[PDB]
Amino acid sequence: GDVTVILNNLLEGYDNKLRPDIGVKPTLIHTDMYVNSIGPVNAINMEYTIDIFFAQTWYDRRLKFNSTIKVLRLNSNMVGKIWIPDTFFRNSKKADAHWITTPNRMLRIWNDGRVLYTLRLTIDAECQLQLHNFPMDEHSCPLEFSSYGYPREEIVYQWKRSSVEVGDTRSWRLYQFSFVGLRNTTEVVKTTSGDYVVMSVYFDLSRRMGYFTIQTYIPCTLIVVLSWVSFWINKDAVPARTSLGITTVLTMTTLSTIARKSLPKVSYVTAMDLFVSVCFIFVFSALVEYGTLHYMDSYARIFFPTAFCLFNLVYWVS
Amino acid sequence: PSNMSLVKETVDRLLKGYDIRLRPDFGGPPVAVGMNIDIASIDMVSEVNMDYTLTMYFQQAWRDKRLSYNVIPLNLTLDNRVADQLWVPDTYFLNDKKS
Amino acid sequence: YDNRLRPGLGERVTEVKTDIFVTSFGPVSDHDMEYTIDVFFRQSWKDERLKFKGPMTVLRLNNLMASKIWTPDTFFHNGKKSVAHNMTMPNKLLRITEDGT
Ligand SMILES: *[C@@H]1O[C@H](CO)[C@@H](O[C@@H]2O[C@H](CO)[C@@H](O[C@@H]3O[C@H](CO[C@H]4O[C@H](CO)[C@@H](O)[C@H](O[C@H]5O[C@H](CO)[C@@H](O)[C@H](O)[C@@H]5O)[C@@H]4O)[C@@H](O)[C@H](O[C@H]4O[C@H](CO)[C@@H](O)[C@H](O)[C@@H]4O[C@H]4O[C@H](CO)[C@@H](O)[C@H](O)[C@@H]4O)[C@@H]3O)[C@H](O)[C@H]2NC(C)=O)[C@H](O)[C@H]1NC(C)=O
Ligand SMILES: *[C@@H]1O[C@H](CO)[C@@H](O[C@@H]2O[C@H](CO)[C@@H](O[C@@H]3O[C@H](CO[C@H]4O[C@H](CO)[C@@H](O)[C@H](O)[C@@H]4O)[C@@H](O)[C@H](O[C@H]4O[C@H](CO)[C@@H](O)[C@H](O)[C@@H]4O)[C@@H]3O)[C@H](O)[C@H]2NC(C)=O)[C@H](O)[C@H]1NC(C)=O
Ligand SMILES: *[C@@H]1O[C@H](CO)[C@@H](O[C@@H]2O[C@H](CO)[C@@H](O[C@@H]3O[C@H](CO)[C@@H](O)[C@H](O)[C@@H]3O)[C@H](O)[C@H]2NC(C)=O)[C@H](O)[C@H]1NC(C)=O
Numbered sequence A: 001g002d003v004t005v006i007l008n009n010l011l012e013g014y015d016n017k018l019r020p021d022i023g024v025k026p027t028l029i030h031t032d033m034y035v036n037s038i039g040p041v042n043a044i045n046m047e048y049t050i051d052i053f054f055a056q057t058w059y060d061r062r063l064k065f066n067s068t069i070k071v072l073r074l075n076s077n078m079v080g081k082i083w084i085p086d087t088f089f090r091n092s093k094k095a096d097a098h099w100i101t102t103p104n105r106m107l108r109i110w111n112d113g114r115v116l117y118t119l120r121l122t123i124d125a126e127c128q129l130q131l132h133n134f135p136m137d138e139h140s141c142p143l144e145f146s147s148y149g150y151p152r153e154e155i156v157y158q159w160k161r162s163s164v165e166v167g168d169t170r171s172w173r174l175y176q177f178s179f180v181g182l183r184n185t186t187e188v189v190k191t192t193s194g195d196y197v198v199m200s201v202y203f204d205l206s207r208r209m210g211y212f213t214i215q216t217y218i219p220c221t222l223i224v225v226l227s228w229v230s231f232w233i234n235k236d237a238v239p240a241r242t243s244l245g246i247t248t249v250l251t252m253t254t255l256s257t258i259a260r261k262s263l264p265k266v267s268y269v270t271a272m273d274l275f276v277s278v279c280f281i282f283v284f285s286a287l288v289e290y291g292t293l294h295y296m297d298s299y300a301r302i303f304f305p306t307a308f309c310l311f312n313l314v315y316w317v318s
Numbered sequence B: 001p002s003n004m005s006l007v008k009e010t011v012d013r014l015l016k017g018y019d020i021r022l023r024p025d026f027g028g029p030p031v032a033v034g035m036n037i038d039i040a041s042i043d044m045v046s047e048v049n050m051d052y053t054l055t056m057y058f059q060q061a062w063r064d065k066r067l068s069y070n071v072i073p074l075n076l077t078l079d080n081r082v083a084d085q086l087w088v089p090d091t092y093f094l095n096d097k098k099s
Numbered sequence C: 001y002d003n004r005l006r007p008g009l010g011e012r013v014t015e016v017k018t019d020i021f022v023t024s025f026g027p028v029s030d031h032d033m034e035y036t037i038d039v040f041f042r043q044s045w046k047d048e049r050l051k052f053k054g055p056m057t058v059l060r061l062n063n064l065m066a067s068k069i070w071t072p073d074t075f076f077h078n079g080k081k082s083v084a085h086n087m088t089m090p091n092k093l094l095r096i097t098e099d100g101t
């Protein structure tokens, strides 16, 4: 055919080991992403999964051909034959391409020398969550990438006009959070091996507390009420009051641990931790209220509901 | 385009008649391999498994008179796939369980 | 034969007739919002280059010939970490009919 001869010519005397314009000028690469889906955010392990169609294009004067054909649209077969930039993701804990049924790669070459090269990737990027106020925390999870070996004098990156074509967010596995928006940057990070141009995409994710309310707060709120009904119970019923008190405080301990279990092992008190601890004070004080009562009931009936609802007023507005 | 052609002859010259099986200065003084690390992260210290996971930019430099060129005045950074055609140290981490 | 160019390039549209036989509909993981399904993913197309005539009308071959010839680059838009089975050999079949199918 007339297309097989073109491909033979392009790879004839083609050095796959040398970048375009080596020793002449830096190679400008225009990147572009279609975020297929932002997968589950793993707050415990401080990571998230993102599936993208990472497309990057550049000029390669070696791969220029003149004919009636405007573009050579090819499969993954030709990817290993030509020079491809060594883009890697700086904060990827683990990533993999897709290979079923065949390698999910695409390659297109125009007459002038343009190369479009896109591939499907599942990136388990690293997002350093700061859960000081949880589960109301909001995060800006990045995704950095750059050439692993080529410094700023050899590979320059740049966002195309269509920065990031975020897909339909309805089908995303993002349950905890909501995709607020995206933001891109471009800056030169200095390292021991040279100066490298880095391009990072920031995804802004806002937590939803609906699950944690039914999961954590509502059980925590309801158990605290069980302490209050101790007051309406007669003081003379010593086993009844202690039964309610010890049962109420002890199950509060289990709720704190299982609620604390959802969080990772971070050495600082979080907002969820603050709520359970205050609820711990009420249940403990309610038990201690009867301890002094046997050794006042009406005041507890008023102060305890007021303090908790007032405490919630201060907490939720914050 | 002279550099593109000139650089191609240089890199082609080096890898021609290059024996990956023999280290630099084989049958001679030891080759001094300098090492340099940049820890990217320490993911998790696990007491249950008695191990920690560390991500690093493990870098090591050494001299190889076979790969010495002087025609072009610049440092050639090549495709990572060239590493399969060059002798590199057989460095291993005696502690690593899964890397 | 050029493995890189699809059949009928520049003159036709390559029509791939596909079909699925679900050997077993795997479990559904509501936690991950995904499901597993084991299939015999059959796809057939016409390739004039692979046209022969001999003692036999269909050449029943193994996976080795598949990598030597052009096959569609089908992928699953909503797929997540599929595996093509390899035990004992690549679980694939190729059959070239004399007409080129
Ligand atoms: C230490 O040992 C380990 C083994 O325990 C080695 O790891 C193996 O390395 C080889 C060589 O790099 C890998 O083979 C390559 O696999 C490619 C696809 O692999 C996918 O499937 C396998 C299962 O079969 C998975 O294991 C892979 O996932 C794992 O690896 C990836 C990285 O590759 C990780 O990111 C994952 O997390 C997993 O850990 C993958 O899912 C395969 O495409 C490739 O074959 C192409 O390239 C060769 C190169 O010459 C060509 O000969 C061949 O024809 C193919 O080329 C076609 O396709 C490319 C694709 O673009 C085109 O560009 C070409 O033009 C052409 O069309 C190769 O077979 C192997 O997968 C991997 N893992 C194993 C065996 O478990 C380590 O390398 C080794 N060394 C060190 C330092 O660790
Ligand atoms: C190809 O790659 C080489 C090596 O990467 C480059 O050579 C380097 O070029 C830079 C630019 O000038 C050099 O920078 C400075 O060089 C000083 C000279 O030191 C020489 O003397 C001893 C040898 O015994 C060593 O220190 C060194 O290897 C040199 O041989 C250094 O003294 C400087 O040190 C400090 O400078 C400032 C101080 O504030 C710090 O910022 C530095 O980090 C460092 O601590 C400095 O290094 C560099 O030394 C050169 N290295 C070598 C090995 O030659 C080529 O330029 C490059 N070619 C290109 C890009 O075309
Ligand atoms: C992702 O990064 C790209 C690259 O920076 C952003 O697009 C770029 O935005 C700048 C700033 O607006 C553009 O320059 C400006 O153009 C306007 C319109 O011509 C002009 O009025 C200004 O004076 C300035 O020159 C730049 O052209 C544009 N990139 C391209 C290729 O045109 C993009 O906004 C980023 N995505 C975000 C922030 O979501």
Ligand SMILES: *[C@@H]1O[C@H](CO)[C@@H](O)[C@H](O)[C@H]1NC(C)=O
Residues within 6 Å of the ligand: A065, A066, A067
């Ligand atoms: C390719 O052909 C066109 C016209 O057919 C011509 O203008 C152009 O210079 C040619 N390019 C080459 C030979 O690199």
Ligand SMILES: CCCCCCCCCCCC
Residues within 6 Å of the ligand: A253, A256, A257, A269, A274, A276, A277, A280
């Ligand atoms: C299970 C939780 C027990 C109560 C924790 C008391 C320590 C103080 C926590 C609040 C500090 C702001």
Ligand SMILES: CCCCCCCCCCCC
Residues within 6 Å of the ligand: A309, A310, A312, A313, A316, A317
């Ligand atoms: C007793 C109070 C319970 C409900 C508190 C809700 C507060 C909403 C704050 C909204 C931001 C101003």
Ligand SMILES: CCCCCCCC
Residues within 6 Å of the ligand: A288, A291, A292, A295
């Ligand atoms: C010292 C712990 C509290 C015990 C109850 C005391 C009531 C006066």
Ligand SMILES: CCCCCCCC
Residues within 6 Å of the ligand: A298, A301, A302, A305
């Ligand atoms: C006698 C007063 C009892 C408490 C009034 C209701 C407060 C929730």
Ligand SMILES: CCCCCCCC
Residues within 6 Å of the ligand: none
């Ligand atoms: C806790 C509110 C119901 C009881 C209020 C009336 C008590 C006399």
Ligand SMILES: CCCCCCCC
Residues within 6 Å of the ligand: A213, A217, A218, A221, A308, A309, A312
């Ligand atoms: C949003 C859950 C808390 C609601 C306030 C409960 C105070 C008694």
